[PDB]
């Protein structure tokens, strides 16, 4: 329509680049196993992530502003303009990723983006209820936070930008109409640790700012970060997750909310099984495939029938921490 022409013509962009040196070291880093034997600890994973980011930043020679809610309150530290923003396990701390992206500066972020719907991340048990991850840090408190969908398709993002109260007064009449000052970013996530596949090393570069119309679509269909909806609308009380394997396999993870048991299966198998008429047929087919483990077939059958169980909340005793 002619409205599309308005958006196409109205570029009015102001590209800004404070010579942010591309951090090619973070991009294209081979998978690594931090723990020589056994399984790594959460503190060890955090230390490895910090060391990797530190080495990259120092090798490039840039500066950094580590964050350890709506405003970062960077004034108390006043870092340089060219310095990067680095955050580790700050999902609980930051209300939104927009808080980090308003600064219109490159962001290096190590986050929790699970590929299993429940289980252990390193030594830290975690579980998803409603749509909030009930993470339990090994040697720490209990974190309750959502996941902000870093790994969905699309490299271009829309985010807010910093605005003062005077700027707020200036733009509020324009804001209510549907006019927003939107910055654009390019995302890269690496997934660098094999033993802990639930944590992603997100990397981001800003590209340029733009004024956009709220009630007008975009030709490139740029996306804005949204909270993930783990709940399965077809089977109440169940969480469903899909992810793509490196060997060209589209697996799916199923499980109940506020619950520990979890199984991964090829998506095609789940779609075939979800249409079977009888419960006994599910077991017959699963035995046909060669799955003899009861823990697998029983969970598949329970998902098929949508069995809801009100599991209780019970006291937990956590592993003793050792500084080493």
């Amino acid at each position: 329509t002619r409205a599309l022409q308005r958006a196409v013509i109205d570029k009015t962009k102001t590209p800004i680049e404070t010579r942010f040196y591309p951090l090619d070291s973070l991009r294209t880093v081979t998978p690594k196993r931090v723990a020589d034997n056994g399984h790594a600890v959460s503190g060890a994973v955090r230390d490895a992530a910090r060391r990797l980011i530190d080495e990259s930043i120092t090798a490039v020679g840039g500066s950094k502003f580590e964050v350890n809610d709506l405003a970062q309150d960077f004034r108390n530290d006043t870092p340089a303009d060219d310095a990067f923003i680095v955050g580790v396990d700050v999902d609980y701390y930051v209300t939104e990723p927009d808080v980090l992206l308003e600064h219109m500066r490159p962001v290096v972020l190590h986050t929790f983006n699970p590929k299993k719907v429940s289980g252990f991340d390193a030594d830290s048990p975690f579980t998803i209820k409603n749509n909030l991850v009930e993470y339990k840090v090994s040697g720490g408190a209990a974190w309750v936070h959502p996941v902000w969908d870093w790994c969905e398709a699309g490299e271009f993002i829309a985010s807010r930008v910093r605005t003062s109260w005077k700027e707020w007064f200036l733009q509020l009449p324009l804001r209510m109409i549907g006019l927003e000052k939107v910055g654009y970013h390019k995302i890269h996530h690496c997934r660098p640790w094999t033993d802990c596949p639930d944590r992603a090393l997100v990397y981001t570069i800003p590209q340029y700012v733009i004024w956009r119309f709220n009630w007008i679509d975009t030709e490139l269909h740029v996306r804005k970060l949204k909270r993930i909806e783990y709940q399965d609308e077809t089977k109440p009380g169940w969480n469903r997750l899909e992810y793509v394997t490196d060997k060209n396999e589209l697996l799916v993870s199923i499980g109940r909310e506020g619950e520990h048991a979890q199984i991964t299966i090829e998506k095609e198998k789940l779609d075939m099984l979800s249409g079977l008429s009888a419960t006994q047929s599910v077991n017959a087919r699963l035995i046909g495939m060669g799955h003899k483990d009861p823990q697998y077939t029983s969970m598949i059958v329970q998902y098929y029938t949508g069995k809801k169980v009100v599991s209780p909340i019970s006291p937990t005793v956590y592993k003793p921490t050792m500084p080493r």
């Binding site: 040196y21 090619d24 070291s25 060391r51 080495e55 120092t58 090798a59 490039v60 020679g61």
Partner: protein
């Protein structure tokens, strides 16, 4: 043979402390102009323009003269070696690396050399230097930086409770693939090399067989500074000439013996060979101005003569009567 053996977590702090001590008081630097680089001392020029300035500024500073021997005249090298051996009371160890440029890991390259260059040079030149380092990853200063890093790692492992500045102040002379260190870390040096992923060869100092350093043999470093070409490396191969086929044998032999006279005039078992080469190939060689105008020309203390003779005999494990017989045979040919 490329290697990607990243070091351990603990070693990273030691490497950062060593890099900071290398930085010292020279926070800011500026690149050199093309003309100045050209008159200093293609592909070599683009990296040299920055690396020569970086070496001259930081590596040749007041607080970095303790270890960066590479970059001084041979008389200065001999003086430094004699001073170091006098300080260590003839208790020193030698390091011999095999294909260091072919064995340094990506983590070491991007956390020692790149870090040092970026900290030394101005921020406005960061992109050029980082691009040059990236091109390098996929000359002389790199070997010195690796040797300094390994020395700092050894010193940190030996005395983990001392301050990093005081630890680094004890760094002995180092020059590329060759260097000197205290003998008290002879066994612990291998473990440090394994942690970094490098291969190290170490030999205890022995006055009977002399000391090996920069292919130079110190006959008696305790008292005299007299020094000679390494006999072990050259005697077994001096009879064969590795010059290109286009050069006549006489010119190559004449250049070799001229260099030997310039460096090893009074060394036993080499002076006789040099004189016999000059006597045989000399008259049959071409004009010396012709070879001075030819590209392949550059492609090559009397008081302790007795002691030098005995030290050479000990180095070559040849009996004195056998040495005299060999000398007589060489002269009479």
């Amino acid at each position: 043979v490329a290697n990607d053996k990243k070091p351990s977590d603990r070693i990273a702090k030691i490497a950062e402390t060593f890099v900071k001590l290398m930085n010292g008081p020279f926070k800011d630097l500026d690149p050199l102009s093309i003309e100045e680089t050209i008159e200093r001392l293609l592909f070599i020029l683009k990296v040299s323009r920055y690396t020569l300035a970086y070496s001259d500024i930081v590596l040749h500073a007041e607080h970095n003269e303790h270890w960066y021997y590479p970059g001084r005249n041979p008389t200065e090298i001999a003086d430094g070696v004699c001073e170091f051996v006098s300080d260590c009371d003839a208790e020193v160890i030698e390091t011999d690396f095999s294909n260091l440029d072919g064995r340094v890991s990506s983590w070491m390259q991007r956390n020692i050399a790149q870090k040092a260059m970026v900290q030394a040079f101005r921020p406005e030149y960061r992109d050029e230097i980082i691009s040059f380092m990236d091109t390098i990853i996929n000359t002389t200063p790199h070997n010195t930086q690796y040797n300094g890093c390994v020395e700092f790692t050894a010193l940190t492992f030996e005395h983990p409770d001392a301050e990093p500045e005081d630890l680094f102040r004890l760094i002995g002379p180092k020059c590329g693939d060759d260097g000197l260190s205290r003998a008290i870390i002879q066994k612990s040096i291998n473990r440090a090399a394994k942690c970094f992923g490098l291969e190290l060869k170490v030999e205890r100092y022995n006055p009977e067989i002399g000391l090996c350093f920069l292919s130079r043999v110190f006959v008696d470093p305790l008292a005299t500074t007299t020094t000679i070409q390494d006999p072990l490396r050259t005697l077994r191969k001096l009879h064969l000439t590795t010059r290109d086929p286009t050069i006549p044998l006489a010119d190559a032999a004449c250049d070799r013996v001229e260099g030997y006279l310039c460096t090893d005039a009074l060394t036993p078992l080499i002076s006789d060979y040099c004189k016999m080469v000059l006597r045989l190939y000399g008259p049959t060689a071409s004009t010396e101005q012709v070879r001075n105008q030819r590209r392949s020309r550059n492609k090559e203390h009397p008081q302790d003569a007795h002691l030098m003779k005995q030290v050479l005999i000990k180095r070559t494990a040849i009996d004195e009567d056998q040495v005299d017989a060999l000398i007589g045979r060489f002269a009479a040919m």
